[PDB]
Design a protein around this nucleic acid. Structure first.
Ligand SMILES: [Mg+2]
Ligand SMILES: [Mg+2]
Ligand SMILES: [Mg+2]
Ligand SMILES: [Mg+2]
Ligand SMILES: [Mg+2]
Ligand SMILES: [Mg+2]
Ligand SMILES: [Mg+2]
Ligand SMILES: [Mg+2]
Ligand SMILES: [Mg+2]
Ligand SMILES: [Mg+2]
Ligand SMILES: [Mg+2]
Ligand SMILES: [Mg+2]
Ligand SMILES: [Mg+2]
Ligand SMILES: [Mg+2]
Ligand SMILES: [Mg+2]
Ligand SMILES: [Mg+2]
Ligand SMILES: [Mg+2]
Ligand SMILES: [Mg+2]
Ligand SMILES: [Mg+2]
Lengths: 188, 53, 155, 260
RNA sequence: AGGACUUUUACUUUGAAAAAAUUAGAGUGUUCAAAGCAGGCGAAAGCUCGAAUAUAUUAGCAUGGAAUAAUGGAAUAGGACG
RNA sequence: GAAACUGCGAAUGGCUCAUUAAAUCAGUUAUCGUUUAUUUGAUAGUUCCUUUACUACAUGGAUAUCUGUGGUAAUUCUAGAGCUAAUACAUGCUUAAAAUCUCGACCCUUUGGAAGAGAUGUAUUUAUUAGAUAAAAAAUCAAUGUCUUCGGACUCCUUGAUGAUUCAUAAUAACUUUUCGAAUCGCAUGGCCUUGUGCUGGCGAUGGUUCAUUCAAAUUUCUGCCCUAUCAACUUUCGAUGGUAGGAUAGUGGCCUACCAUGGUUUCAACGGGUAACGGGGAAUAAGGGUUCGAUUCCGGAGAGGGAGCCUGAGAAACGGCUACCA
């Protein structure tokens, strides 16, 4: 019943438009997903023209991507620490798009270990020659190593759990991460 | 129930799928050869333009 | 009317899906994406090397210019990131064979790449519905001043 | 209306079906198909009205059902099939073959055309795109999707579908000095040569056309259909070849060619 | 067919567009007419011309013109060219 | 060939003009801002996952119709029992090759180069990359690739469309409470002889993913509305104008939320009031200019007593569809 038509809004001038027609079905709006953490529970909704949509309330784990070396891994979302729209979602741990969450960060860790093996936080000849060809080029910046030692990664979600049903995003990295720490240090 | 007509339909479906795949790959190969021919022609034209200029 | 900080608000301001690799050592400013709206409209150099973001930039944002092209005069530049353009015309009353001066107020969304002020004639172009009322994106500030190009007088 | 509309009142039918304003409340609404209903022609209109082979709806139904109509080499047993421009209608009875081309008055005239050329069909390229797995394809005005076309076939161009295999046989490239047909507006049925094609950056291309009688007009590019090279049309043009004789010239034709 | 600069209009000619019905109007002995889009001609042995055109005066698009009416250049030269 | 299950339409058509004064509507645009049953044209080997143990010559259970027992005063009211089917509901099999990615039982001193092993269809979601292109030559260090007729040469690099794109498309990494990839029907049942129920085999009918096309649907740009100032300021705490992010949407959009800015219209009549106002194509009237009418044969819009709410579907806020309040 939640309409999104422009009729109920006043005109640009400000006049109160009289009711022209009772609100249609191609103008409907549905309830907010306001997703949570834990015990995956996705509800399908049959929208216009079939095309199943998936409400992703109570989602615990999802895919997350690392842009620098560009590798994606399934990992667990562990709480939300910042939301650019409403901090009330942060206090209620409501997970929507562009929210900022923490990551278990292990899968990235042993992927790094089996990929470069730099022993963060502080063999076959083929692998050794691959590492030699790499030539310690894995000079990833210091702050991500800091939270790797902490163990929880700072990721920003990019998928829309309200529509898609998935929980995908990317790690804050580069100046991105910097900016948000400032905001987080404002919270701190 | 298993009927020779049902087996005939199954065989027809399988054969149609295989034949369609073969035809599609043949068309793709022919298009690739046509692209190669056109590329050779315009590369020869470009070489002639470079030589004359 | 533009903040010195390139992002001032709570959310970060990025151009979506253009990524600058910090692991690489090129260390240029950023990777700024841009496009030309066509119709023989020159993208401003202030947009080409600018550092604003303006999601609804015809030159850097996702919005595309298509449809009507309207030339008008700025009547209100004093509401954020947007312009209010006065378009004047003559309606032809035929019962008298006489014309009638009339005006309409077209809201639009001027990119930070342009420096506008009250009185500049502006070429603006149609786009998607950007807000409740704005549907046009400013594409050219033809008359930057008009009669204020020469200001002082020192012989 | 809430949903699609499925009735076409008689006055609302196009003035090119040119039916009788009396003797019926409704008109045959063309079912969904290869052509726009405003531009198409239902089979019932083509048989009952244009050809008079039938008498009414039941007769057209019986004709179509027994599989004597063949639209572009296919049966098309539905009464309101939208047989559009340049389609080929084959009747094995009377062994007759028709190709739908507008007569210069601007109407789907009955064009009895030979069997040998009835094998193929002409078409206008409306889109050239790259479908899945990087496969180029071309969409004609019929909605035919021809896969793997010639690499230098572009939009607005014309092609010669063999209509048996449904693949590309030959094509004509759009450019100045080329025989052309018109398929919309006042210039329906007119045939000429492209003199100039003014670009008009921002949309709605226009082309200037000069016919054999040395008359000149201008028409939209969406409205244009290249038909061959001057003096060598790729199809059999209808009677009159679309010169658009003036009303006084038509009167002189009536007076001069007159035998009773 | 490409980079390049485009003073901007108002005005006016031409064209594309303004659904059919309606109005106008061409052809046609519905027995005349209102109408209708029919019909006509063979030897009677299938052969046929049709279903014409114009207007809509506003808004938009293209186009030729540059009188009439308005705006803009170079005055601190920060002007134009090489 | 009743009945019933299945499928499809029932959202078309028909009627009325109550509401509605930038609202509808008309002309003209846009969707590079979206959904689209159907019709038409194309469209997929991978469902194997360690393939040296499986139903693919066909996997499972219900269920109406029906047989019988009832109830209620009655309604297209149906509870209990017993069988039974599918293009209903569920599962699920083949099946190639090729190439590309990744991981190595070793050697032999570099130009290191190789036995071999797993994944890759499509669909979804997210990150990243390619998606070029105004024009002739260089040197140089840094890295290191082919051939070397051991000087060194590097000569060859493929790229579609629009006016414009993050477009079309392709590629890598991953993701999925893992969509589709025919366990379906009719007719004719030919050919090969590996002469057996063996191998193949035509014309269709229904389905079916995606992309187009069509019928469309939603929004959408400019301009145009009757009377009234005895309606001059109107709108914003409750969105009023804009910004950003999110939610919702099929999709853009204060459409909604959170935080900001204080904005938007107006003497070119905004806002308010009236309309015994649905808009238009048109009708009457006729020197020319006009005046009045247009509920109604066509196109749009809205409504089903007034109101709200919603299931099914591609399409309804449906009403000869349901839910509730009011009458
Ligand atoms: Mg209706
Ligand atoms: Mg008309
Ligand atoms: Mg008359
Ligand atoms: Mg009012
Ligand atoms: Mg890119
Ligand atoms: Mg894309
Ligand atoms: Mg938004
Ligand atoms: Mg009225
Ligand atoms: Mg009323
Ligand atoms: Mg009316
Ligand atoms: Mg009334
Ligand atoms: Mg009506
Ligand atoms: Mg209704
Ligand atoms: Mg009543
Ligand atoms: Mg249905
Ligand atoms: Mg209702
Ligand atoms: Mg009723
Ligand atoms: Mg009804
Ligand atoms: Mg009911």
């Amino acid at each position: 019943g939640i309409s999104r038509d422009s009729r109920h809004k006043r005109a640009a001038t400000g006049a109160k438009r009289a009711q022209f027609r009772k609100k249609r079905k191609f103008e409907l709006g549905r309830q907010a997903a306001n997703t949570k953490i834990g015990t995956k529970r996705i509800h399908p909704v049959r929208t216009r023209g079939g095309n199943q949509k998936f409400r992703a309330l109570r989602i615990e784990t999802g895919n997350f991507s690392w842009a620098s070396e560009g590798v994606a891994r399934k990992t667990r979302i562990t709480g939300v620490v910042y939301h650019p729209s409403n901090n009330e979602l942060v206090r209620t741990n409501t997970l929507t798009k562009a929210a900022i969450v923490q990551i278990d960060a292990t899968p990235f860790r042993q992927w790094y270990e089996s990929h470069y093996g730099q022993s963060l936080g502080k063999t076959s000849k083929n692998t050794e020659r691959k590492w030699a060809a790499r030539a310690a080029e894995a000079k990833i910046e210091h702050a991500v190593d800091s939270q790797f030692g902490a163990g929880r990664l700072y990721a920003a979600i990019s998928s829309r759990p309200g529509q898609s049903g998935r929980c995908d995003g990317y790690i804050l990295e580069g100046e991105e991460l910097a900016f948000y720490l400032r905001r987080l240090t404002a919270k701190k | 129930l298993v009927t020779p007509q049902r087996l005939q339909r199954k065989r027809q479906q399988k054969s149609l799928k295989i034949k369609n795949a073969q035809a599609q790959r043949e068309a793709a190969a022919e298009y690739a050869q046509l692209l190669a021919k056109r590329l050779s022609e315009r590369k020869a034209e470009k070489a002639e333009v470079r030589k004359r200029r | 009317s533009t903040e010195l900080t390139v992002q001032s608000e709570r959310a970060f301001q990025k151009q979506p899906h253009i990524f600058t690799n910090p692991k690489a050592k090129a260390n240029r400013k950023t990777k700024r994406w841009y496009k030309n709206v066509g119709l023989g409209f020159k993208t401003p150099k202030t947009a080409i090397e600018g550092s604003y973001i303006d999601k609804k930039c015809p030159f850097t944002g996702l919005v595309s210019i298509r449809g009507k092209i309207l030339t008008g005069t700025v009547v209100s530049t004093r509401m954020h990131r947007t312009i209010v353009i006065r378009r004047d015309y003559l309606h032809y009353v035929p019962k008298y064979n006489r014309y009638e001066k009339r005006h309409k107020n077209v809201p639009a969304h001027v990119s930070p790449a342009f420096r506008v002020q009250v009185g500049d004639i502006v070429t603006v172009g149609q786009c998607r519905p950007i807000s409740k009322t704005v549907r046009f994106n400013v594409l050219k500030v033809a008359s930057a001043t008009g009669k204020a190009n020469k200001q002082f007088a020192k012989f | 209306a809430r949903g699609p509309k499925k009735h076409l009142k008689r006055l609302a039918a196009p003035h090119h079906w040119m039916l009788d304003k009396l003797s019926g409340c409704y008109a045959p609404r063309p079912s969904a198909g290869p052509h726009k209903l405003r531009e198409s022609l239902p089979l019932i209109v083509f048989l009952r009205n244009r050809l008079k082979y039938a008498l009414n709806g039941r007769e057209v139904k019986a004709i179509l059902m027994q599989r004597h109509v063949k639209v572009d080499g296919k049966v098309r047993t539905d009464t309101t099939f939208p047989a559009g421009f340049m389609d080929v209608i084959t009747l094995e009875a009377t062994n007759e073959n028709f190709r739908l081309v507008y007569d210069v008055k601007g109407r789907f005239a009955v064009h009895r055309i030979t069997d040998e050329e009835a094998s193929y069909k002409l078409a206008k390229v409306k889109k050239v795109q790259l479908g899945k797995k990087g496969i180029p394809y071309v969409v004609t005005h019929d909605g035919r999707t021809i896969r793997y076309p010639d690499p230098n076939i572009k939009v607005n161009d014309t092609v010669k579908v063999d209509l048996a295999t449904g693949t590309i046989t030959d094509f004509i490239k759009f450019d100045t000095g080329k025989l052309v047909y018109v398929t919309g507006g006042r210039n329906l049925g007119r045939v000429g040569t492209i003199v100039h094609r003014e670009r008009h950056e921002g949309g709605f291309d226009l082309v200037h056309i000069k016919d054999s009688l040395e008359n000149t007009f201008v028409t939209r590019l969406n409205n244009v259909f290249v038909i061959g090279e001057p003096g060598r049309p790729w199809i059999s043009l209808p009677k009159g070849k679309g010169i658009k004789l003036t009303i006084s010239e038509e009167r002189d034709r009536r007076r001069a060619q007159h035998g009773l």
